[PDB]
């Protein structure tokens, strides 16, 4: 009768908008249960061949499906009340470009509240199986350390941290609920890769995985807002250059492109960023997911909605010193 309990707290503003997703599909807002499931496939998947079939077998065997009951019961409870959103703060705090789609929804009045930094949430994992309560907790751990939840969370919203917990599974694995140093970060990542393999038993894949991903940090900043604002300056220059670039390519003079001297040269990979707390101080966190399946830079929708790609790392690392936490690449 296993049970893991956690209290997580927002580091950056968190927008949980599952509700808007039926009318507006641009408003993808992954929940905690949602994002845990994702991170599981990115831990496990570091061990499966390009064997999507088997990964789906294990994934459904843990989290459940339409033809299966879950072996783990994930209970999430807000402990804070949503606060009224202050549209004045995007100009004031210099987050006007990264969180543009939020400000837009705010001004239209589609959203009026949000969980501001400090909001707490209780997550409680229960399972009769030990193999399962270990995999579920690594997923939650991965979510907090490398991921995010909510609308625009791959751009700094929904960054989380653990403030109190009662985990017999992290104790067992020799893991922490916080990072006192960067070396702690590095070591735990390594540890999570190794332990995940064993629990399961026993050439790059098509899906995103933790094994094949770069993780970088920088700072510390004075506060969380100073970090976010750095991303916002960097993104703005990215966006300026990007717009100029794609009007050249798509609508300018027709030119015949040359095949790259290296296979899959212009296939740039997804990049999420956020805010991690290391030693009590705020760091910018960046993660790049390298895989084989393709993802076009070019989608039918406004270019301020286009996914940020790995070629963005320049616009941070050329402007302030960056530290590599995880080098798989
Ligand atoms: N953990 C996490 N996953 C996300 C976030 N945004 C999108 N995703 C997941 O990653 C993918 C990025 O588009 C999405 O589809 P996918 O499930 O097909 O991989 C989604 O499930 C996020 O902010 N956090």
């Amino acid at each position: 009768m296993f049970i893991e309990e956690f209290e997580i707290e927002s580091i950056t503003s968190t927008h949980l908008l599952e509700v808007l997703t039926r009318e507006y599909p641009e408003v993808r807002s992954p929940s905690i249960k949602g994002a845990m499931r994702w991170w599981f496939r990115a831990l496990a998947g570091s061990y499966f061949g390009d064997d999507a079939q088997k990964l789906k077998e294990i994934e459904n065997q843990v989290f459940g499906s339409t033809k299966e009951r879950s072996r783990v019961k994930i209970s999430v409870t807000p402990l804070s009340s949503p606060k009224r959103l202050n549209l004045k703060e995007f100009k004031d705090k210099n987050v006007g470009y990264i969180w543009f789609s939020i400000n837009l929804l705010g001004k239209r009045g589609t959203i009026t509240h949000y969980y501001p930094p400090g909001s707490r949430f209780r997550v409680v994992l229960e399972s009769p199986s030990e193999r399962v309560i270990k995999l579920a907790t690594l997923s939650l751990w991965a979510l907090v350390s490398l991921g995010s939840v909510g609308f625009r969370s791959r751009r700094g919203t929904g960054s989380m941290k653990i403030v109190r917990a009662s985990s017999e599974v992290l104790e067992d694995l020799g893991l922490t609920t916080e990072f006192n140093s960067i070396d702690e970060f590095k070591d735990s990542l390594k540890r999570v890769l190794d332990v995940t393999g064993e629990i399961l038993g026993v050439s790059l894949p098509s899906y995103a995985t933790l094994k094949f991903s770069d993780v970088e940090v920088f700072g510390p900043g004075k506060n969380t807002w100073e970090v976010l604002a750095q991303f916002n300056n960097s993104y703005k220059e990215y966006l300026r250059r990007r717009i100029k670039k794609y009007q050249r390519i798509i609508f300018g003079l027709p030119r015949f492109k040359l095949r790259g001297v290296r296979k899959d040269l212009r296939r740039a990979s997804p990049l999420w960023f956020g805010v991690v707390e290391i030693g009590g101080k705020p760091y910018g966190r960046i993660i790049k997911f390298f895989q084989s399946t393709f993802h076009p830079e070019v989608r039918s929708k406004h270019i301020v909605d286009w996914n940020v790609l790995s070629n963005f790392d320049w616009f941070i690392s050329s402007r302030l010193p960056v530290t590599k936490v995880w080098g798989g690449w």
Side-chain angles (χ1 to χ4, degrees), residues 2-65 67-68 70-87 89-90 92-201 204-262 265-266 268-328:
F2 302 102
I3 174 187
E4 306 278 301
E5 315 185 65
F6 303 81
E7 255 204 40
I8 69 195
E9 173 195 307
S10 304
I11 297 177
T12 61
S13 326
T14 306
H15 299 262
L16 307 185
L17 304 179
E18 282 203 306
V19 182
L20 306 190
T21 304
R22 196 188 168 264
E23 291 174 12
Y24 318 100
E26 176 61 29
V27 185
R28 278 179 299 258
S29 165
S31 57
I32 287 158
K33 319 176 176 211
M36 274 169 63
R37 195 193 195 103
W38 193 87
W39 273 110
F40 175 78
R41 332 180 59 255
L43 283 175
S46 330
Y47 287 114
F48 288 162
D50 255 345
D51 189 346
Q53 191 197 249
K54 172 134 222 247
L55 181 49
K56 212 66 168 201
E57 301 199 44
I58 323 295
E59 175 200 332
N60 288 309
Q61 218 192 358
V62 164
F63 291 93
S65 51
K67 194 69 193 259
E68 211 163 5
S70 61
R71 291 200 214 269
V72 51
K73 178 192 166 191
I74 310 176
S75 323
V76 185
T77 312
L79 309 177
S80 293
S81 40
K83 309 286 173 304
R84 188 167 175 91
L85 172 62
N86 181 3
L87 303 200
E89 264 199 341
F90 295 83
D92 289 350
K93 292 303 181 186
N94 204 353
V95 289
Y97 290 91
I98 35 163
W99 296 354
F100 170 97
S101 296
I102 295 185
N103 196 1
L104 183 45
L105 292 173
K107 292 181 194 166
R108 292 206 317 164
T110 310
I111 67 190
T112 41
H113 304 277
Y114 76 117
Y115 296 99
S119 315
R120 278 162 195 203
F121 300 88
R122 174 138 321 160
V123 186
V124 176
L125 314 180
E126 283 158 296
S127 175
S129 164
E130 200 186 55
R131 208 177 65 112
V132 170
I133 200 77
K134 285 184 165 194
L135 293 182
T137 296
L138 288 176
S139 304
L140 177 57
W141 181 94
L143 170 49
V144 188
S145 295
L146 305 170
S148 309
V149 294
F151 177 61
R152 284 291 188 264
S153 44
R154 312 182 267 162
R155 285 194 215 193
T157 81
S159 276
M160 297 287 168
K161 83 181 187 194
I162 311 191
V163 288
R164 65 182 43 103
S166 184
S167 176
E168 281 185 26
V169 169
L170 289 188
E171 212 180 347
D172 187 8
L173 298 185
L175 283 165
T176 66
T177 69
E178 63 275 293
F179 300 130
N180 301 343
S181 64
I182 291 198
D183 259 22
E184 214 150 51
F185 201 172
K186 306 216 238 169
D187 295 344
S188 322
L189 275 190
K190 176 71 194 317
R191 167 68 48 81
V192 165
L193 265 203
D194 300 2
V195 164
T196 319
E198 287 169 42
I199 303 187
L200 291 178
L204 172 147
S206 69
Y207 34 98
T209 67
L210 170 63
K211 186 200 212 83
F212 299 112
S213 57
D214 275 12
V215 181
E216 315 184 308
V217 300
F218 66 83
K222 185 186 177 178
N223 46 75
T224 296
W225 288 113
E226 187 189 59
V227 169
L228 282 178
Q230 267 302 324
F231 283 128
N232 187 62
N233 291 338
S234 295
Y235 177 73
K236 202 194 156 196
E237 183 55 15
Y238 184 61
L239 194 39
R240 190 195 70 74
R241 303 229 196 142
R242 194 176 218 189
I243 295 165
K244 194 193 168 309
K245 170 181 175 179
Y246 275 98
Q247 264 165 1
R248 215 175 32 74
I249 302 167
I250 299 171
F251 300 100
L253 179 93
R255 296 254 191 75
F256 274 95
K257 327 175 139 206
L258 291 168
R259 178 178 303 276
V261 161
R262 161 183 312 152
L265 187 73
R266 305 183 217 190
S269 310
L271 195 152
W272 307 355
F273 55 91
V275 182
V276 68
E277 210 163 270
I278 300 173
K281 306 172 176 187
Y283 284 79
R285 182 183 62 225
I286 295 180
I287 176 165
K288 295 167 278 197
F289 293 102
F290 310 123
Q291 75 270 67
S292 49
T293 210
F294 177 77
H295 321 259
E297 195 164 11
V298 211
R299 192 92 62 224
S300 88
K301 56 175 186 192
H302 201 284
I303 195 180
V304 64
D305 286 327
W306 288 13
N307 297 7
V308 170
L309 302 192
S310 69
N311 71 334
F312 168 67
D313 49 12
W314 164 260
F315 297 87
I316 296 282
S317 73
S318 68
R319 288 182 64 252
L320 40 86
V322 171
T323 299
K324 182 135 288 176
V325 179
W326 183 255

